[PDB]
Amino acid sequence: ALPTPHEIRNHLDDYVIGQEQAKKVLAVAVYNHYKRLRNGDTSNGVELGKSNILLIGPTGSGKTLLAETLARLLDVPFTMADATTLTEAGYVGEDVENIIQKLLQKSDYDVQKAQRGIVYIDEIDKISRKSDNPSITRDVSGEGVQQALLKLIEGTVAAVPPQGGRKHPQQEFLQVDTSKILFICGGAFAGLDKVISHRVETGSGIGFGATVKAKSDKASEGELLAQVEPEDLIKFGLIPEFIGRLPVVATLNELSEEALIQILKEPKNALTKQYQALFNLEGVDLEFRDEALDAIAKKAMARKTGARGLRSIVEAALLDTMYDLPSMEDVEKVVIDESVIDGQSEPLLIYG
Amino acid sequence: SALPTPHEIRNHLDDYVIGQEQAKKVLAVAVYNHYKRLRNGDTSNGVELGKSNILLIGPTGSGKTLLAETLARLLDVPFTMADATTLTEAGYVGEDVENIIQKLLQKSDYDVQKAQRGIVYIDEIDKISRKSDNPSITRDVSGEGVQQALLKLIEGTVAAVPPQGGRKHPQQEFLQVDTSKILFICGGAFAGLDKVISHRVETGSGIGFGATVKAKSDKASEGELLAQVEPEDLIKFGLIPEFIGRLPVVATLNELSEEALIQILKEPKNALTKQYQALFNLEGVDLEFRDEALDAIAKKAMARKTGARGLRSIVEAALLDTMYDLPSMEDVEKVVIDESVIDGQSEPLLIYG
Amino acid sequence: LTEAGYVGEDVENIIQKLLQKSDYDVQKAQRGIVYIDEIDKISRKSDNPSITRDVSGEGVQQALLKLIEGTVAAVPPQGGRKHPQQEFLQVDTSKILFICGGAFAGLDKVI
Amino acid sequence: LTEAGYVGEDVENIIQKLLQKSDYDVQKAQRGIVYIDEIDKISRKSDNPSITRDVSGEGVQQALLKLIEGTVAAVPPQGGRKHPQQEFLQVDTSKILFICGGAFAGLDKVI
Amino acid sequence: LTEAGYVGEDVENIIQKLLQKSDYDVQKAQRGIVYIDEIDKISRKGEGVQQALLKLIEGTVAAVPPQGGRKHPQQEFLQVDTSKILFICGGAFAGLDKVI
Amino acid sequence: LTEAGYVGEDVENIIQKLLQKSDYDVQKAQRGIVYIDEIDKISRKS
Amino acid sequence: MISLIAALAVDRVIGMENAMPWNLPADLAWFKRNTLDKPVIMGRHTWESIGRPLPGRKNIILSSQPGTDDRVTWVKSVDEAIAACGDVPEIMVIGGGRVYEQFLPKAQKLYLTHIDAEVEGDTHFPDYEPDDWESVFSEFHDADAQNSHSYCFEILERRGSHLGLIEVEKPLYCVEPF
Amino acid sequence: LVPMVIEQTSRGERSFDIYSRLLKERVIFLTGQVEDHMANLIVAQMLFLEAENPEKDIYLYINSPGGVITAGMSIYDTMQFIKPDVSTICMGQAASMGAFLLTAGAKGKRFCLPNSRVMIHQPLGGYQGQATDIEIHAREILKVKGRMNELMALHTGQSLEQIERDTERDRFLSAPEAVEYGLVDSILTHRN
Numbered sequence A: 001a002l003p004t005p006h007e008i009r010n011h012l013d014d015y016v017i018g019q020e021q022a023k024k025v026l027a028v029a030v031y032n033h034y035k036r037l038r039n040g041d042t043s044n045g046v047e048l049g050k051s052n053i054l055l056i057g058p059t060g061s062g063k064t065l066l067a068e069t070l071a072r073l074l075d076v077p078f079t080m081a082d083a084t085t086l087t088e089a090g091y092v093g094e095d096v097e098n099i100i101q102k103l104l105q106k107s108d109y110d111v112q113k114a115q116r117g118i119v120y121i122d123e124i125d126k127i128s129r130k131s132d133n134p135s136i137t138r139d140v141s142g143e144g145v146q147q148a149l150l151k152l153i154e155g156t157v158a159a160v161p162p163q164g165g166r167k168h169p170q171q172e173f174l175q176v177d178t179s180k181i182l183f184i185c186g187g188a189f190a191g192l193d194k195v196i197s198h199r200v201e202t203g204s205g206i207g208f209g210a211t212v213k214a215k216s217d218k219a220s221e222g223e224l225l226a227q228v229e230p231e232d233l234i235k236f237g238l239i240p241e242f243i244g245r246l247p248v249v250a251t252l253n254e255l256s257e258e259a260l261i262q263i264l265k266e267p268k269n270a271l272t273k274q275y276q277a278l279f280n281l282e283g284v285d286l287e288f289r290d291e292a293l294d295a296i297a298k299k300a301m302a303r304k305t306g307a308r309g310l311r312s313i314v315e316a317a318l319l320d321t322m323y324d325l326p327s328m329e330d331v332e333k334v335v336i337d338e339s340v341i342d343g344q345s346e347p348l349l350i351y352g
Numbered sequence B: 001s002a003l004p005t006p007h008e009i010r011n012h013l014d015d016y017v018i019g020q021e022q023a024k025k026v027l028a029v030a031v032y033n034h035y036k037r038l039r040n041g042d043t044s045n046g047v048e049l050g051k052s053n054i055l056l057i058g059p060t061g062s063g064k065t066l067l068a069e070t071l072a073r074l075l076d077v078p079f080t081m082a083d084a085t086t087l088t089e090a091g092y093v094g095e096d097v098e099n100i101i102q103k104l105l106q107k108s109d110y111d112v113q114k115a116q117r118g119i120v121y122i123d124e125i126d127k128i129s130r131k132s133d134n135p136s137i138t139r140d141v142s143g144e145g146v147q148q149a150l151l152k153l154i155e156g157t158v159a160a161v162p163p164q165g166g167r168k169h170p171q172q173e174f175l176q177v178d179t180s181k182i183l184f185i186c187g188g189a190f191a192g193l194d195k196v197i198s199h200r201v202e203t204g205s206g207i208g209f210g211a212t213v214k215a216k217s218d219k220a221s222e223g224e225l226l227a228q229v230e231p232e233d234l235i236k237f238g239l240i241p242e243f244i245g246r247l248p249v250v251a252t253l254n255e256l257s258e259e260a261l262i263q264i265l266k267e268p269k270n271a272l273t274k275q276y277q278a279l280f281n282l283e284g285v286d287l288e289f290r291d292e293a294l295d296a297i298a299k300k301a302m303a304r305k306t307g308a309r310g311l312r313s314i315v316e317a318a319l320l321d322t323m324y325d326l327p328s329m330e331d332v333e334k335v336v337i338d339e340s341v342i343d344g345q346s347e348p349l350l351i352y353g
Numbered sequence C, D: 001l002t003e004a005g006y007v008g009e010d011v012e013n014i015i016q017k018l019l020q021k022s023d024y025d026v027q028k029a030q031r032g033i034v035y036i037d038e039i040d041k042i043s044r045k046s047d048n049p050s051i052t053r054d055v056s057g058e059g060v061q062q063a064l065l066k067l068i069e070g071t072v073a074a075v076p077p078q079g080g081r082k083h084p085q086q087e088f089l090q091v092d093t094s095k096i097l098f099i100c101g102g103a104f105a106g107l108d109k110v111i
Numbered sequence E: 001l002t003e004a005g006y007v008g009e010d011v012e013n014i015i016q017k018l019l020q021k022s023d024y025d026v027q028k029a030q031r032g033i034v035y036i037d038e039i040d041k042i043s044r045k046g047e048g049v050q051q052a053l054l055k056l057i058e059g060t061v062a063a064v065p066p067q068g069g070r071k072h073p074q075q076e077f078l079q080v081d082t083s084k085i086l087f088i089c090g091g092a093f094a095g096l097d098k099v100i
Numbered sequence F: 001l002t003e004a005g006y007v008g009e010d011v012e013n014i015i016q017k018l019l020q021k022s023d024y025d026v027q028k029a030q031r032g033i034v035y036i037d038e039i040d041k042i043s044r045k046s
Numbered sequence G: 001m002i003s004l005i006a007a008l009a010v011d012r013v014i015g016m017e018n019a020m021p022w023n024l025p026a027d028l029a030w031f032k033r034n035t036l037d038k039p040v041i042m043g044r045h046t047w048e049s050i051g052r053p054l055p056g057r058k059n060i061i062l063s064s065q066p067g068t069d070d071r072v073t074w075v076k077s078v079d080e081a082i083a084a085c086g087d088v089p090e091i092m093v094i095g096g097g098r099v100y101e102q103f104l105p106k107a108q109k110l111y112l113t114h115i116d117a118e119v120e121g122d123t124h125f126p127d128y129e130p131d132d133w134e135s136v137f138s139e140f141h142d143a144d145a146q147n148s149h150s151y152c153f154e155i156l157e158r159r160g161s162h163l164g165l166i167e168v169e170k171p172l173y174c175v176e177p178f
Numbered sequence H: 001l002v003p004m005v006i007e008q009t010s011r012g013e014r015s016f017d018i019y020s021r022l023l024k025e026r027v028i029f030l031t032g033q034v035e036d037h038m039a040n041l042i043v044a045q046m047l048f049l050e051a052e053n054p055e056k057d058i059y060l061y062i063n064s065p066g067g068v069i070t071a072g073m074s075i076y077d078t079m080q081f082i083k084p085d086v087s088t089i090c091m092g093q094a095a096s097m098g099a100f101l102l103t104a105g106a107k108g109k110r111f112c113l114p115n116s117r118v119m120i121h122q123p124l125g126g127y128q129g130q131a132t133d134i135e136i137h138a139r140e141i142l143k144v145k146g147r148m149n150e151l152m153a154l155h156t157g158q159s160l161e162q163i164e165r166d167t168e169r170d171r172f173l174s175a176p177e178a179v180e181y182g183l184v185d186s187i188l189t190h191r192n
């Protein structure tokens, strides 16, 4: 039988760490989509609709990771896109219809399979117009792409170019309905926190009755992002029509030191495991002390780049080691301690 | 012919659309007036009557597209929906307005008569408004370039009929059914027009004791401003004056109210409440929506400013947690949603069974 | 380089160059190295308000985010012998090491 | 000349004019001399803070850093009898002398 | 007219109009008499527009967009030497009388 | 109306609109009149 | 969705009426490959050079005169010809100069084959500048036994490119009591 | 000399005087003797702020020792006329006009620093001339006293009789004592 949201969440926890809301939203969406496909006979007068998600989270949170993780377990055709390449129709840039073409290729030209798929339009925050104010020039890559997608999210018949997908000998426009295709958008929306603060926090001024926080008690990006409303997204530069087609708005939370520590070893393809593979394929063991992981997390948080910061800190700590060790002989293991992460000491190589 | 009257079709449009009384009348009167000329063609009348091309201007989630779709169901003439965001100037790689007529022929079943009696709903007409202030280097291949092409179709051109269905033989059956006898309905939300209209009707404010200072709540909504729209406002928005002139009747929708939103939740054939109940019953659980919750949901949706679409957001959120654990837990018969759940202070009670 | 939909170049031509060197061998090109010089000239003029699209600055940064990390680029099938008539070659950029470079004149003051 | 992606001209035109005089022979064009007049008009107007993007000034200076030194430029399709368009003639500007003349009105005071 | 990089019509455009009147010919255009006008009012505090024209008037080859009679068959953009065109630049210098 | 045989509307269309009106007779065509309107809009203050 | 597949030679000397001055088999292969299973609008002059009906294609000769054959579709106007193709996803124009000149303004793609051989043809392809034609596919071959001279292929799509703006600022001016 | 400060905005940095900078934050200063010239200046500021945002409160600081009554009745009428609530903060001293303009603030938005002093007395005047004119001027000053006494009773909550018995002679009230009469509502001691 179909898998339950709990089961799906488990598969999404092997790779992601610390995003409970996004995992539930995506799980029910997939669950609903699965039953909306199984129940194709429509044994009710109602014509069951679809809800599109809009992942709004900070950098290095797991937006793209979740999308990739989903494609591993699901069976229906899944595709990924990039809003930076898409442009309005009639320009050198890519066309929105190309998305369906890529979905058809993964569906093996089975329109029925493609007609019920899941799309992931990434970098949806880059097509946001400068502001709600009118655009003096044609925003080919901005508004243009938004206005072009409006029909695709609610549903329409797209004329994919002939001889597409798997079918090579075809000379007739194939038709695919976009009314049952779950479009999961996603962006970083850098600068939205300020817009939200201007609404959720007012009174800031000079005087005895004004408000001052000193940035210690001020709300964090995650806290502010969890209060996002359509009015804010409009100011950020998303036309109201586009927001309407994205009812569900799931917000990710800025990873914490505790979460970063778990991401270094718990995930399926955790950072630590990646490096151990390198040292191991050459013939040397690698291990990280628990105290080291804690130190790395503190440094990464200061970089303000999310989980990406970890890779930088790790590469530096083992830079010299990875430069001289390939020539070293009679070495079997390396040990990274807290001292190495701060530079006071150098990794102790166990000779043998 | 002309069996249904404007009142009749209005009663048919109310089954799917809740509200927009003036819009329904305009769409009804125009459709009936255009149909009467179609009954007899020229009606052996010397004077030439003007067309009734409609211009639907309403907020997001008001029912613009819904009206066109439901109207097509009760109509018999061919109806083809076109999106103005995919149409480009002639020659470029994007679609051309000419294929709109071709699509109509497919729906018309290649019947020249039916073809010249169809209705063409051109959605998103507000996305082609020329904005670039004297570029002088590039081409508006998605703006003014398309507005001029549309003028030709609504003001007359040839629509040569090829024998698409019948096996193409060396025979020319093209009689050129002029497109002037086609009712063009152009929709669009015209986001920003309210500001334009405000300036023209702006009373003007001062600083003294005799000035007109009004609070934000004391101002007028886009619905009220849109109702007072005039052709001059559409030109400032970026529409050719000749283009708007071809569309004499403008139907202005009004932002849905709490009452209208409450009705949309249960009255419509495929309302949200019924949609969620269907999937909840597909699993084997009954869904019950208290009337108190319905008004609460409407209050929140009114603030999202996304029209009827806001309803799906509020509902999906409230049931997120439930829909996550419900498919796994057993011994559950019914679920009841109360006002407290919507606010977020309570958890939906379950009728264990 | 310039944002998509503008007269300038695009971030996909970089793969074309890499392809030519690899002799249009997608497998070889997928495991290549790239060096983007002058990466300090596409910097965003943060002091200006976000009122215009920096097709030369921030526009190019937003386009490389998925390239430097990994995507499926669509390059024109151009070359001496190209079997796909119009089936744009798909190249994965998840194994292509990018080595940016810039002079960053003025960064010393910021620090 | 202006930065890429704008209404003005591009720095690659300079190499196109050199082909018109070289009978569209890249080999010969790669061993020619150039003279860029009015090089004092592409200088920052004491705009060290870099408030906005000087597409006509600093922007042009940032585009010549590799043309004056050497790079494989993408010459516009053609201005002669070349039939194809995508050819995008590739010329190496690493053996092309580059003279630059200006008036530098005001430099006398600075000195 | 305006400098390069701006929305304002470029100086090269004047060469286009000149060739059109020439009926797609070089000999005639080479023996043509262009007449710039309203030279005043583009002076200092303007300077940029006067810098571009400063070269055209004293000889410069310019790419003539190939459009017109048979879309100008010549594939070399019908270049034309601007060192033989008599530039009769006029204008009503309002105020010069006082300066003098 | 826009630049003749360039970006925008083609002015040549106007001389063709009256060509059929003149039954493809150059004589009658020359005797025709072209009523241009809304010229105050395209006037500069480009 | 019209196309104008041709075999343009130096200085765009199509030479369609007069028998092909090169007879390159490869050029015909490119033609065949990109024109099979789709309608092929042509001209009466071009139809007199091939003679036999092209197999697998909906031949549509645009001849003002009445139809002389019954194995190919016959049209007598440009507007009806495009309609006569139907709703096919891509149309190919193979007619001579007159045909090309009439369909080019409404053409989206161009399947050009640039032959290097120089001939004094009387008919020529229309002029097409390159800024508005964004190439997609290009192939370069070399002269061989069957192909007297070299032959290059190319495909283009009409697509527009936008340009940035001046990015002007709004200066402020302060006023004091005196 | 008034120091000049800079304010960073999206358009750029602008230099304004300290008082003008605070005006942008809806802060009006009432310092020194009250007269027609300074009264009109405050009236203009109140009207200007109302147009900018008729829903945001206005703060009026009061460090004045008193002044002309007529000058202070214009400010009072202007505060009661405009829609936004006008908050009043006593800073150091508040005499008859200052205290009358301190209790006239919006209910719930009146403040008095911990070491501030408030003094309330009856109107002062005088006239030299014929007996007939003295009577005319005497009756008018007695109407202003009754009128001002009634307005204070309305804004403080005390009975008119008490106000008459407490304003006959100078009455000094500390911040804690003002809260018990009604001239102010709360006392600001720290940010939080």
Ligand SMILES: CN(Cc1cnc2nc(N)nc(N)c2n1)c1ccc(C(=O)N[C@@H](CCC(=O)O)C(=O)O)cc1
Pocket: G005, G006, G007, G020, G027, G028, G029, G030, G031, G032, G049, G050, G054, G055, G093, G094, G095, G111, G112, G113
């Ligand atoms: C005279 N002529 C016109 C001709 C020739 N080459 C072209 N080449 C191109 N690229 N485009 C054209 N328009 C074109 N037209 C010809 C000559 C032969 C065939 C022909 O016999 N075609 C075969 C293919 C060749 C074969 O196998 O015999 C077919 O099946 O269509 C067609 C057109």
Ligand SMILES: Nc1ncnc2c1ncn2[C@@H]1O[C@H](COP(=O)(O)OP(=O)(O)OP(=O)(O)O)[C@@H](O)[C@H]1O
Pocket: A015, A016, A017, A018, A019, A057, A058, A059, A060, A061, A062, A063, A064, A065, A066, A123, A187, A188, A255, A263, A267, A306, A307, A308, C065
């Ligand atoms: N919660 C997490 N668990 C595991 N890995 C994570 C997590 N968050 C980020 N990562 C790491 O970050 C990378 C994924 O980046 P992510 O999907 O967050 O893109 P993004 O930064 O959100 O996109 P953008 O750059 O547009 O903001 C992966 O390499 C992964 O190792």
Ligand SMILES: Nc1ncnc2c1ncn2[C@@H]1O[C@H](COP(=O)(O)OP(=O)(O)OP(=O)(O)O)[C@@H](O)[C@H]1O
Pocket: A241, B016, B017, B018, B019, B020, B058, B059, B060, B061, B062, B063, B064, B065, B066, B067, B188, B189, B264, B268, B307, B308, B309
């Ligand atoms: N008056 C109404 N009665 C019933 N349902 C409505 C009404 N208005 C909106 N809806 C709901 O909104 C959805 C359709 O919205 P619609 O397409 O009419 O908005 P729109 O005005 O076309 O938006 P846009 O201006 O962005 O195109 C349907 O799911 C429908 O249930």
Ligand SMILES: [Mg+2]
Pocket: A063, A064, A065, A122
């Ligand atoms: Mg990402």
Ligand SMILES: [Mg+2]
Pocket: B064, B065, B123
């Ligand atoms: Mg709609």
